Design a protein around this ligand. Structure first.
Ligand SMILES: [Cl-]
Ligand SMILES: [Cl-]
Ligand SMILES: [Cl-]
Lengths: 217, 216
């Protein structure tokens, strides 16, 4: 069987994932690559059942039947309307403690734990308690709503692929204001095709100029 | 009390709708604005059932309880990988009949009729039958898949708010390669807040150099 099945959180298409898949396809003309959008939690049973072979997700959910490699962390940004006071710090950055009384749009609306779990945790980690929280379906909706004046949202740096009139991305300076990208696979030896996918990720990351950590992939 | 409820197709947040909503909000400090993401089909029933007061959609479903106003037509474009042959005539543009042997990604997967209905209809309208079609959930899936090398996609021009590495947007030349933007309200709707909403649309459109939408 020359088929590999890859699960991915949809919003990862705003980042390096499409470049990775494009290079992978080029490297493997005889391979059928099937792409399936699914939340990070859903990738656990998909891997266990053999419905996907590798899953690109935004957190690590422990299950004995699967294993994980952290690919990288993205910086979080604060998406704001251009008229917001916070946008005056567009070039400099702000901190989590500048955000606690703002209307924050969280996402996605899929089962917990999800992307938003870590976002709320980094507030809790420093004794900060956001007083105005709303959950919306997914990140590009949150961004559109921010542009419409509905509030602010903490978003991965990769979401800057989306640029909207009077939408601005403000850096978050807290060193832990970051969000992980993981690759998850079955808890067994990776296939030749999955090992090749690892090498493709390495190559794209090298083109981006990322420094590899020790014993990476 | 006092509240206005606005239904909208999610992808319309990539165009002028947010700045319309924001300008409108500024003019009404006492107004609660509730925004609801929903497909154009759902807006019709939501309007008849009183769950929204105005719907911004991408097609017209005729119903005697609803009245529509065509705000404008967006040009359709072809999203392609940078290396695609179609991307060699981005300046001059291509026609629908140039797309027929390509793998076309349709969207969204919401109930029909939807954006993809008109897309397939404009091909059918000229005796063109795309030989390879696949439906995906919504526009960003299509764009990512195009960027990943899986095919091409027809998208509204406002989609260009999303820029991906090696993703290019090619104009279409067919005069009917367009997609409408409608506002829909209940037939006997005469609220001052709805009047104000239409005037806000008018002001935003005027500033962009567009034609004034139809009369109240
Ligand atoms: Cl998301
Ligand atoms: Cl628009
Ligand atoms: Cl040309």
């Amino acid at each position: 069987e020359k088929t590999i099945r890859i699960g991915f959180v949809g919003s990862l298409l705003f980042g390096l994932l499409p470049r990775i898949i494009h290079l992978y396809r080029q490297a493997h003309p005889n391979l059928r690559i099937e792409l399936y959008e699914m939340g990070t939690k859903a990738q656990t049973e998909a891997l266990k059942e053999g419905r996907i072979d590798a899953g690109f997700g935004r957190l690590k959910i422990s299950d004995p039947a699967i294993k994980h490699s952290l690919l990288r962390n993205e910086r979080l940004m604060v998406a704001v309307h251009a008229s917001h006071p916070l946008n005056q710090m567009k070039d400099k950055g702000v901190h989590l403690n500048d955000l606690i009384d703002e209307k924050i749009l969280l996402y996605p609306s899929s089962p917990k734990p999800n992307f938003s779990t870590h976002v709320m945790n980094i507030f809790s980690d420093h004794g900060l308690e956001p007083t105005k929280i709303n959950e919306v379906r997914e990140v590009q909706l949150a961004l559109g709503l921010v542009a419409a004046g509905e509030g602010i949202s903490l978003v991965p740096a990769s979401t800057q692929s989306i640029q909207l009139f009077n939408l601005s991305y403000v850096p978050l300076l807290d060193p832990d204001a970051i969000t992980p990208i993981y690759i998850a696979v079955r808890n067994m030896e990776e296939s030749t095709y999955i090992y090749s996918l690892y090498e493709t990720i390495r190559q794209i990351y090298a083109y981006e100029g990322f420094t590899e950590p020790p014993n990476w992939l």
